[PDB]
Write a protein that binds this ligand. Structure first.
Ligand SMILES: *[C@@H]1O[C@H](CO)[C@@H](O[C@@H]2O[C@H](CO)[C@@H](O[C@@H]3O[C@H](CO[C@H]4O[C@H](CO)[C@@H](O)[C@H](O[C@H]5O[C@H](CO)[C@@H](O)[C@H](O)[C@@H]5O)[C@@H]4O)[C@@H](O)[C@H](O[C@H]4O[C@H](CO)[C@@H](O)[C@H](O)[C@@H]4O)[C@@H]3O)[C@H](O)[C@H]2NC(C)=O)[C@H](O)[C@H]1NC(C)=O
Ligand SMILES: *[C@@H]1O[C@H](CO)[C@@H](O[C@@H]2O[C@H](CO)[C@@H](O[C@@H]3O[C@H](CO[C@H]4O[C@H](CO)[C@@H](O)[C@H](O[C@H]5O[C@H](CO)[C@@H](O)[C@H](O)[C@@H]5O)[C@@H]4O)[C@@H](O)[C@H](O[C@H]4O[C@H](CO)[C@@H](O)[C@H](O)[C@@H]4O)[C@@H]3O)[C@H](O)[C@H]2NC(C)=O)[C@H](O)[C@H]1NC(C)=O
Ligand SMILES: *[C@@H]1O[C@H](CO)[C@@H](O[C@@H]2O[C@H](CO)[C@@H](O[C@@H]3O[C@H](CO)[C@@H](O)[C@H](O)[C@@H]3O)[C@H](O)[C@H]2NC(C)=O)[C@H](O)[C@H]1NC(C)=O
Ligand SMILES: *[C@@H]1O[C@H](CO)[C@@H](O[C@@H]2O[C@H](CO)[C@@H](O[C@@H]3O[C@H](CO)[C@@H](O)[C@H](O)[C@@H]3O)[C@H](O)[C@H]2NC(C)=O)[C@H](O)[C@H]1NC(C)=O
Ligand SMILES: *[C@@H]1O[C@H](CO)[C@@H](O[C@@H]2O[C@H](CO)[C@@H](O[C@@H]3O[C@H](CO)[C@@H](O)[C@H](O)[C@@H]3O)[C@H](O)[C@H]2NC(C)=O)[C@H](O)[C@H]1NC(C)=O
Ligand SMILES: *[C@@H]1O[C@H](CO)[C@@H](O[C@@H]2O[C@H](CO)[C@@H](O)[C@H](O)[C@H]2NC(C)=O)[C@H](O)[C@H]1NC(C)=O
Lengths: 257, 264, 247, 120, 207, 120, 120
């Protein structure tokens, strides 16, 4: 292959790649009677994939793979899918090496582009991905829901048990703070709030409102002694109901989005 | 040796002496009774098989002093070609049983350029073709068995010979007993101290129960950073969620008794 | 029909007798190397490492009389191995920390000749470059740091650099996107620098970065404020409950 | 160093040989059994690895004999199931260094037991 | 630049332009008054000294767009050879006075193959021979002083020429005040609040 | 940009000069002092670095002059001793960029002061 | 500079030599002992590592002399035990840098002691 001419195909998205080189280069070269060449190689490609994270744990993406000639322009070298578009990119049935993503499929096409060194023809393949929500349910959502419910149980303790109510509120607020801190490790430093950020913020609001409820009842039991117990009796049902409706809206939203 | 096995990477690192053996009628020589052994640099002057590892992620031939290769010729022209290789190979793992799991990691050997019409692979000595399995010393796993296979694999460009080397790895549970399960049990037992504290010491009851719940949540969240974020419940996840249910009901219990005592 | 042999012998005639060692017009006036950069993307920008990683198409133009040809009207593109058979400038990035030319299938080089002897030489490069940051105002800061392009061996009397196309010489920078930062402005500068070994040409490419404040609001200020407000709840808890007030 | 002592010899059927090891056995992860008799070279019989449990057997005893271990007692056992007349030999217990060569070669073993004669 | 000094690995990372001068009469030429600045690829066709760094943990010569080397031949046969090198070098540190310590890192330069009978090293320009010490941007340290050494060091294989460059570092105490001592002092101060809470509040004073 | 304002010029002995700086000084970490005697080319005198404190001098003024800085006030001070007539000139204060070349060459300095005179 | 001093020399048998060090000895981790009889070259004797404790000897004194140290006192001691008439010489206590070459060559040692005498 070093003696023959071969196309200079390169991948536009490639951040870092390996042409496997173990036990002789992993390259295949066959030459037909009529001069047709067939030339094949094994590659590992780390490809730059842009993607939007507004729906972080419930998102779907299409990572591109773009490749074409590096030096030879549109008027010299052109690429064509060998067996037609649909039949030209084949995925191994056992090739799903994905942990948290499910590859929904792929679509392939072609483009012309214009560059400072002339026109070029690009082959394109987009792999459609949909994230599997199961991990984040047990890692973030159940902890948040359990914390929100764990704050509301303090409404069944008698109003005069100040230290107990105080420690419930404080500890649950700390739980939410640490959950918020840890959730940020799962993503790059995106400069906008994701869906899981909305959920964490709303659960935090419920937790902090549970603390504020105790603060209010403790204030009024001293300031104006009583009927103030109806605050407990109301919150004791209102908070569960409002959190439930919050969930019925949130999940109804992002499972249909 | 098998150097390390990683769930987060879904791979393992294997170091091996890899050898190949074939006739080349062009290299037959006469008048010399010896098996000629030559400097390894002859390897760049001879034809050698295009053998490669299909599931290899990253590998290299060792190169200290001089590249670790060997060629030994014999009068009839048979060539013995050997390499020392370190390879990091993919091994997708089913962790639903983790850490009580066992895994079938394999190395897939194949000829890249030549089809079955040009190359044939076979294990020299059959089942005795692979040795050194006795000197693998993984902390996490004990090798229950290893198995050798031979096949033809078909692609759009032709049918190619394959050889496969497999290991059955079964994990050692003692580490997890000492580090994870026993602390979870102890924290769960710590919850039951609540029922011995008098029911009017509300601050102590609440502090102990909420501390138990918080510690259990931290135990839950710490572990999953050490292993891939795979989207299903593992054995240890079910265990820890059950323990969470117990310690949570062990605080809903205090809520019940306090409500019955002070209010109803 | 006969063009193949004609162009083969043309190229052989060009290379036969060609000396790699000598720059164009050696001993004569300096060679003018015009440069273009097409920014592919800017990878992570790191405060902790005080650097940023950049990926780009990097192109250089110069004229070498030794490579002029007349029989073929084409702008002649040649296999990239020719670059090892030609003189090419020793441009290097003075502030880089770790960098490499891409080799996904073949090393990403480009050689295109023209009848008048002008050579177009292109590379695709990923480079990690030092980028010092004034953190006195972080996270409300804006940072300026550059890519420094210089010739390693030849002084200004042997090579001259210039931005080919003036302020239009760089592209892509107007389109890249970063999580933390947004490109406010980019400037192209050319000058020379003096050492004891002589005066050397330089081109400098600069980016000015404005930080996106949202992420730091989410990370830092929200929990700090809300822990602070949490403490004020003490002022409403009855002042006979020492346990709660202290806890 | 490592010291080896063996038991279970004498005239024979079925039988069990045993080998007790003491000292720095961690440097010697693999224990091997060898046998010899007059007019013949020393034979490899089988091997065991401390803390791994893996075994390999010579085809002459494959599916007849088995080797096992007790890591806490630091003892290695060879189950002489279904003996035959040709098995007459002195059986030696030996230790193999971690980076010695192949199993099947006695020269790779450093510390050798006293050896038990068996008669059949 | 010195990119970083690390205690966790007892090393520092250094980048430099390394220059070498020697006379090779075989390369003397006449008829050209100019200095022949040849393409760096000539260096592979000439004899060059085997200089190496004793205490480098690893090093590499920058290579993008060309291997970063310089060759310049003077008519009298003098060769100027230089290349840009990034080295990670070992530096044992005495941490017994950690926040207020003063470390002494060095770079030791020696010929790998030729002994004193074949090669001699010297600093071209004496104490002027090293520059760029003014542009070290270390946050944790500051360059108090540097000075240069030359000596012959003897092994069983012979006596070898050696040069060594040394840096004396003084640590910037500012970071450790904010992130170890202010927390320590404040927590110690906060502990005395227990003496102001009333004695009967067992829960508060213990917590 | 960056602006430099000088002070301390005039007839002298020992003396001090001052050079305050304003603007985007973070991009120009080194400040250098130069001088130009009448009818002669500009000369290097010394330099100092922001946040580094390291200094270097022309061989003719080593141990005769000194230089120091105040990083909060954003000013640099140059001190002189054993003054004699050959030192008379209009002294300058200038800033160098982070990645510009060597110190001793004024071509590398982008911003310059007023050029205070000194006499004896 | 690191400083060295010596004591204990004289006509002895068995005997003790004492050597004391001060300064930034962390730079010079290895100490050494040397000697020369009148009219002869300076011979190597032994060496000791600060805080490591490793030692090496010249075979002419192996198993007769031993070198020891005290980190707190910053002293190194050499046991002139089992003395022989061939040992009469002035003994020098010396220090060696981290990256200097072989231990057996005095040229690699920078700071040197007084050269106390021993006689028999
Ligand atoms: C890890 O996991 C991998 C993957 O699961 C395991 O690998 C498998 O190992 C088994 C052995 O345990 C392999 O089976 C053997 O394969 C060969 C080759 O068979 C192929 O080639 C034949 C020749 O062309 C062909 O006829 C075969 O097809 C016929 O037979 C199969 C039988 O399964 C049948 O399904 C077909 O319809 C055809 O009739 C096939 O293409 C073969 O030599 C072996 O045959 C032995 O066993 C059979 C049992 O019925 C017996 O009939 C024979 O006489 C003979 O004794 C045997 O089938 C299998 O190929 C491997 N699979 C893959 C994908 O690699 C591995 O074992 C695991 N390791 C560990 C340690 O757990
Ligand atoms: C990020 O940060 C970097 C570093 O701070 C910024 O880089 C700076 O960019 C500015 C432009 O925005 C540069 O200044 C320009 O430089 C050139 C070159 O000047 C040099 O070369 C000339 C010959 O080619 C020479 O004439 C110059 O000497 C004259 O000018 C100097 C400086 O004023 C003066 O002291 C002399 O006496 C001379 O008068 C000098 O050697 C220059 O062309 C630019 O315009 C000036 O000069 C021309 C004449 O040359 C004149 O017509 C114009 O009116 C104008 O006076 C201009 O000065 C600066 O050098 C860069 N700094 C460094 C260290 O390289 C970068 O801008 C920042 N980027 C962002 C995006 O924020
Ligand atoms: C992959 O494997 C190859 C082969 O083992 C590695 O070695 C490289 O092989 C080529 C020849 O195929 C060497 O070419 C050199 O070329 C010139 C003539 O052009 C000549 O001077 C030399 O004798 C030599 O043949 C090349 O030097 C060699 N490279 C190295 C670093 O040893 C190759 O490096 C492996 N990796 C990759 C990514 O290719
Ligand atoms: C050159 O190498 C070859 C091997 O490539 C050597 O030939 C081999 O020699 C051994 C004995 O040294 C033979 O082993 C015997 O084989 C049979 C089973 O086939 C068995 O009855 C015996 O127990 C014994 O093991 C072996 O067969 C023979 N051939 C092969 C393919 O291994 C040869 O001796 C070497 N020559 C020199 C001069 O070194
Ligand atoms: C081979 O490459 C050269 C590179 O210079 C090509 O030269 C091209 O020549 C044309 C005609 O002069 C230039 O057109 C420009 O167009 C605008 C008006 O549209 C005007 O502003 C300019 O005055 C100029 O004429 C063009 O810039 C120039 N370069 C390119 C990249 O097209 C030449 O055409 C090429 N030849 C072949 C056969 O491919
Ligand atoms: C990419 O560019 C090529 C340039 O050849 C285009 O091919 C031409 O397509 C038109 C119709 O759009 C035909 O009339 C021409 O005959 C084609 N030329 C050749 C040489 O084949 C091609 O259509 C472009 N493709 C896209 C997607 O823009």
């Amino acid at each position: 292959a070093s003696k023959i001419w071969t196309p200079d195909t390169f991948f536009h998205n490639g951040k870092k790649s390996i042409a496997h080189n173990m036990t002789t280069p992993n390259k295949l070269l066959r030459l037909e009677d009529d001069g047709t060449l067939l030339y094949t190689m094994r590659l590992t490609i780390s490809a730059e994939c842009p993607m939007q994270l507004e729906d972080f744990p419930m998102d779907a993406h299409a990572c591109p793979l773009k490749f074409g000639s590096y030096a030879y322009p549109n008027s010299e070298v052109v690429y064509v899918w060998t067996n037609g578009s649909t039949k030209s990119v084949v995925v191994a049935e056992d090739g799903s090496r994905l942990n948290q993503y499910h590859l929904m499929g792929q679509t392939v096409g072609t483009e012309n582009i214009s560059t400072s060194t002339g026109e070029y023809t690009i082959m394109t393949a987009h792999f459609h991905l949909k994230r599997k929500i199961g991990y984040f349910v047990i890692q973030t959502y159940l902890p948040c829901i359990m914390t929100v419910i764990l704050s509301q149980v303090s409404f069944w303790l008698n109003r005069e048990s100040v230290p107990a109510r105080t420690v419930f509120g404080v500890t649950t607020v700390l739980t939410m703070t640490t959950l918020s801190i840890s959730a940020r490790n799962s993503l790059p430093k995106v400069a906008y709030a994701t869906a899981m950020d909305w959920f964490i913020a709303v659960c935090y609001a419920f937790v902090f409102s549970a603390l504020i409820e105790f603060a209010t009842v403790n204030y009024f039991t001293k300031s104006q002694p009583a009927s103030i117990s109806k605050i407990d009796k109301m919150s004791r049902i209102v908070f569960p109901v409002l959190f439930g409706t919050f969930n019925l809206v949130y999940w109804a939203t992002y499972l249909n989005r | 040796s098998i150097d390390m096995v990683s769930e987060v990477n879904m791979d393992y690192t294997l170091t091996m002496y890899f050898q190949q053996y074939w006739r080349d009628k062009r290299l037959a020589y006469s008048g010399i009774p010896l098996n000629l052994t030559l400097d390894n640099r002859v390897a760049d002057q001879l034809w050698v098989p295009d053998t490669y590892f299909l599931n290899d992620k990253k590998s290299f031939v060792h190169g200290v002093t001089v590249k670790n290769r060997m060629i030994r010729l014999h009068p009839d022209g048979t060539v013995l070609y050997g390499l020392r290789i370190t390879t990091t190979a993919a091994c997708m793992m089913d962790l639903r049983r983790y850490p009580l799991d066992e895994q079938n990691c394999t190395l897939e050997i194949e000829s890249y350029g030549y089809t079955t019409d040009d190359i044939e692979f076979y294990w020299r000595g059959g089942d005795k073709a692979v040795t050194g399995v006795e000197r693998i010393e993984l902390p996490q796993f004990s090798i229950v068995e290893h198995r050798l296979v031979s096949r033809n694999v078909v692609f759009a460009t032709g049918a190619y010979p394959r050889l496969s080397l497999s290991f059955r790895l079964k994990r050692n549970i003692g580490y997890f007993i000492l580090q994870t399960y026993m602390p979870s049990i102890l924290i769960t037992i710590l919850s039951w101290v609540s029922f011995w504290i008098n029911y009017d010491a509300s601050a102590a009851r609440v502090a102990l129960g909420i501390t138990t719940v918080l510690t259990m949540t931290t135990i839950n969240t710490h572990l999953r950073e050490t292993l891939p974020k795979i989207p299903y419940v593992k054995a240890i996840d079910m265990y820890l969620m059950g323990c969470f249910v117990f310690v949570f009901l062990a605080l809903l219990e205090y809520a019940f008794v306090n409500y019955i005592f002070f209010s109803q | 029909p006969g063009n193949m042999s004609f162009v083969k012998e043309t190229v052989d005639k060009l290379l036969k007798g060609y000396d790699i060692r000598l720059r164009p017009d050696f001993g004569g006036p300096p060679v003018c190397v015009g440069m273009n950069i097409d920014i592919a993307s800017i990878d992570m920008v790191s405060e902790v490492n005080m650097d940023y990683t950049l990926t780009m198409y990097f192109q250089q133009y110069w004229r070498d009389k030794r490579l002029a040809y007349s029989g073929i009207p084409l702008n002649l593109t040649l296999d990239n191995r020719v670059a090892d058979q030609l003189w090419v400038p020793d441009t290097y990035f003075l502030n880089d920390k770790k960098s490499f030319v891409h080799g996904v299938t073949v090393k990403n080089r480009m050689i295109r000749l023209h009848p008048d002897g002008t050579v177009l030489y292109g590379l695709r490069i990923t480079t990690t470059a030092a980028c010092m940051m004034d953190l006195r105002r972080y996270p409300l800061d804006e940072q300026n740091c550059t890519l420094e392009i210089e010739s390693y061996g030849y002084t200004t009397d042997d090579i001259e650099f210039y931005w080919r196309g003036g302020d239009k010489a760089v592209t892509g920078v107007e389109r890249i996107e970063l999580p933390q930062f947004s490109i406010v402005e980019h400037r192209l500068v050319s000058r020379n620098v003096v050492f004891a070994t002589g005066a050397y040409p330089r081109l400098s490419l600069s980016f000015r970065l404005k930080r996106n404040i949202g992420y730091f609001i989410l990370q830092t200020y929200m929990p700090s404020i809300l822990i602070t407000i949490l403490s004020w709840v003490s002022f409403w808890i009855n002042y006979d409950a020492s346990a709660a007030r202290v806890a | 160093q490592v010291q080896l002592v063996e038991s279970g010899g004498g005239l024979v059927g079925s039988l069990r040989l045993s080998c007790a090891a003491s000292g720095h056995t961690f440097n010697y992860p693999i224990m091997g059994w060898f046998r010899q008799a007059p007019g013949k070279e020393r034979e490899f019989v089988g091997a065991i690895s401390w803390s791994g449990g893996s075994t390999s057997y010579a085809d002459s005893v494959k599916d007849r004999f088995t080797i096992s271990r007790d890591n806490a007692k630091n003892t290695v056992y060879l189950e002489m199931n279904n003996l035959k007349p040709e098995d007459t030999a002195v059986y030696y217990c030996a230790a193999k260094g971690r980076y010695s060569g192949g199993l099947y070669y006695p020269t790779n073993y450093d510390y050798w037991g006293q050896g038990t004669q068996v008669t059949v």
